[PDB]
A = this chain, B = another copy of it.
Amino acid sequence: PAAAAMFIVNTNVPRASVPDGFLSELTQQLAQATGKPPQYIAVHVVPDQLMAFGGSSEPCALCSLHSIGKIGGAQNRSYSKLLCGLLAERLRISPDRVYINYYDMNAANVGWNNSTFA
């Protein structure tokens, strides 16, 4: 599929708790997992959010992975283990307090560089 993918993390954990290296690690790990070049992976981390999961304000995250292709039942299970693992290790968020929404984007529906990936 065309090369783009993007991963967003929204979390209540504080800015101070995001490791140096985290966005770079997300980029490299997602490139590897999706088979996409890192040049076309975008990552976005949003700490300090007002959020709750199950009515509790213990650490949690709501995430999205938008990808042109490379989305499906088995792949998404694999991404979830990878990404929950990174959020647990790096941000100290329990995997049972993380949702990740997966979106398979059509290339014609991803704009870039004044045009689209179609």
What residues make up the interface of A, taking CB atoms closer than 8 Å to B? 4, 6, 8, 10, 15, 18, 23-24, 26-28, 38-47, 49-55, 57, 60, 62-63, 66, 71-73, 76-77, 79-81, 83-85, 95-96, 98-105, 108-116, 118
- The closest CB in chain B to the CB of A65 belongs to B111
Q: How many copies does the complex hold?
A: 3
Contact check: which of B50, B55, B114 meets A44 at CB < 8 Å? B50
Contact check: which of B47, B60, B73 meets A42 at CB < 8 Å? B60
Give the CA-CA distance A81 to B66 in the complex, in Å. 21
B-side contacts of A101, CB under 8 Å: 6, 66, 103, 105, 109-111
Main secondary structure of the interface of A (DSSP, over half): mixed
B-side contacts of A52, CB under 8 Å: 23-24, 26-27, 42-44
B-side contacts of A46, CB under 8 Å: 49-50
What 19 additional pairs, Cβ within 8 angstroms, besides A41-B53, A80-B116, A85-B114?
A6-B99, A24-B55, A27-B54, A28-B55, A42-B62, A42-B99, A44-B49, A44-B50, A45-B50, A46-B49, A47-B50, A76-B108, A77-B115, A80-B112, A80-B113, A81-B114, A98-B112, A100-B110, A102-B110
